[PDB]
Write a protein that binds this ligand. Structure first.
Ligand SMILES: Cc1cc2nc3c(=O)[nH]c(=O)nc-3n(C[C@H](O)[C@H](O)[C@H](O)COP(=O)(O)OP(=O)(O)OC[C@H]3O[C@@H](n4cnc5c(N)ncnc54)[C@H](O)[C@@H]3O)c2cc1C
Length: 453
């Protein structure tokens, strides 16, 4: 157990009650450093461990596609945690008022949570700190190397964050120890009813077509830790060999499709890296996949951790802010509203077909994600309007939405974060441009459009 994975946010006097694991980002029982760190401290104090999840009031800011995927995975998690004699408590409302009330009611001895560099998680941490007198720690269970240990600084490029992450891999890339069950079973509603009431509250804002039928197809990704592992096994066995040569072709499903399980924390990235590193495949394809799940995934947490305004124009590089400001008054070719972007009613069939894959599957291809966001900057009134539209459409319809990957990805597409300056164009400036003809020379754009009518 590396002590560099755990951070102390506030000290205090330890109580003689159950160690509380405030689960948030990592919703799994296996390969969870935060849950394992809570069981170790609970064992050292001769007291069982408990897990608490808060169903926040911000669930209506998303959709049914993310509400059902999360709660259905939590239902499987409760059975898995109960088999280890670890009881789970699902509170509903403000985590600042619920976690404070749970710790005081149940006489908690130590509170533990998982690490998330997002602003909304820091908002909960600030409120819970104000009304708790017991120790409270946080553990990085999402990244292989802790976010505060990989770099003490915002890395402006992947060429600089790669040697720092790979030099610390022999230390943090290790096997997980078995989660020991509680010694004895210790001493606020069922998730089936919370799923029924929540869906009934999200029904009027459901994504529908003109025929009143639903648009989302929930048979593409089955939720749960069991299904998350089966997806990783299928990728290593069938798709990992052809990954390095077909990750940029949206007409072929050659990606790992592990992003919805990785966002909600249903599967550990360290577990995926461990199975891939010991797998024998194309070295060019293994290097490309490890570059995506290690470098670009953890540099997204690095961007959100060392940039408070990671979702704003101020976090852009100085060369991009100066380039975008010099082309602010440039006459845009087209100006579409948020409703026209949402329904995919633009003149570009490639962008519209990309938006249709986002609305129907909740997981648009990785290559088209760059074309989908860069066109928003080209057809918006201002770079700040492009950030708002793309963030809203990402977090609302992407199953992996509301994730540091999405915020670092959108910062690269429009703001050029972790990128370089390209040829100076109008409107877009020195931001890397992706043309429609450039996509046709890379893949069958006609098949990708015909698939998502
Ligand atoms: C405009 C835009 C929006 C995005 N929105 C999201 C989002 O809402 N949520 C989200 O998790 N990711 C987002 N991404 C990153 C990336 O596109 C997706 O992670 C990817 O499409 C997920 O599909 P996959 O896991 O099957 O691909 P794979 O090739 O199997 O990648 C595996 C994993 O590596 C990581 N990874 C790979 N590429 C990236 C990347 N560019 N950035 C960060 N991590 C990466 C991911 O964790 C990914 O799950 C976005 C990127 C862009 C440019």
């Amino acid at each position: 157990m590396n002590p560099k994975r755990i951070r102390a946010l506030k000290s205090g006097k330890q109580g003689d009650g159950p160690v509380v694991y405030w689960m948030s980002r990592d919703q799994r029982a296996e390969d969870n450093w935060a849950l394992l760190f809570s069981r170790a401290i609970a064992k050292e104090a001769n007291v069982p461990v408990v897990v608490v999840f808060c169903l926040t009031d911000e669930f209506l800011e998303a959709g049914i596609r993310q509400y059902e995927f999360m709660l259905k995975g939590l239902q499987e998690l409760e059975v898995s945690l109960s088999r280890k004699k670890i009881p789970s408590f699902f509170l509903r409302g403000d985590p600042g008022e619920k976690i404070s009330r749970f710790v005081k009611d149940y006489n908690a001895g130590t509170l533990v949570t998982d690490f998330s560099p997002l602003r909304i998680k820091n908002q909960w941490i600030e409120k819970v700190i104000s009304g708790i007198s017991i120790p409270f720690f946080e553990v990085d269970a999402h990244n292989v190397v802790p976010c505060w240990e990989a770099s003490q600084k915002h890395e402006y490029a992947a060429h600089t964050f790669r040697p720092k992450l790979y030099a610390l891999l022999p230390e943090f890339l290790e096997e997980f120890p078995e989660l020991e069950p509680n010694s004895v079973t210790p001493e606020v509603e069922t998730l089936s009813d919370v799923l029924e009431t929540g869906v009934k509250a999200l029904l009027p804002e459901r994504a529908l077509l003109k025929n009143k039928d639903p648009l989302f197809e929930p048979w593409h990704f089955e939720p749960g830790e069991k299904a998350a592992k089966k997806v990783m096994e299928s990728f290593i066995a069938d798709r990992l060999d052809s990954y390095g040569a077909l990750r940029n072709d949206p007409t072929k499903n050659m990606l790992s499709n592990l992003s919805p399980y990785l966002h909600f924390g249903q599967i550990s990235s360290q577990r995926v890296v461990l199975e891939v590193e010991k797998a024998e495949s194309n070295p060019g394809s293994k290097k490309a996949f490890l570059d995506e799940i290690l470098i670009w995934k953890e540099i997204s947490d690095n961007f959100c951790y060392y940039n408070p305004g990671y979702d704003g124009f101020e976090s852009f590089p100085s060369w991009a802010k100066e380039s975008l400001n010099a082309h602010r008054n440039d006459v845009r070719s087209h100006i579409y509203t948020l409703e026209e972007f949402e329904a995919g009613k633009t003149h570009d069939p490639l962008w519209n077909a990309s938006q249709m894959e986002l609305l129907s599957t909740g997981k648009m291809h990785g290559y088209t994600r760059m074309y989908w966001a860069k066109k928003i900057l080209e057809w918006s009134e201002s770079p700040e309007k492009a950030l708002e539209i793309a963030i809203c459409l990402n977090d609302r319809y992407e199953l992996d939405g509301r994730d540091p990957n999405g915020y670092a990805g959108i910062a690269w597409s429009i703001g050029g974060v972790h990128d370089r300056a390209w040829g100076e164009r109008e409107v877009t400036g020195k931001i890397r441009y992706m043309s429609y003809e450039g996509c046709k020379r890379k893949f069958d754009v006609k098949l990708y459009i015909e698939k998502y009518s």
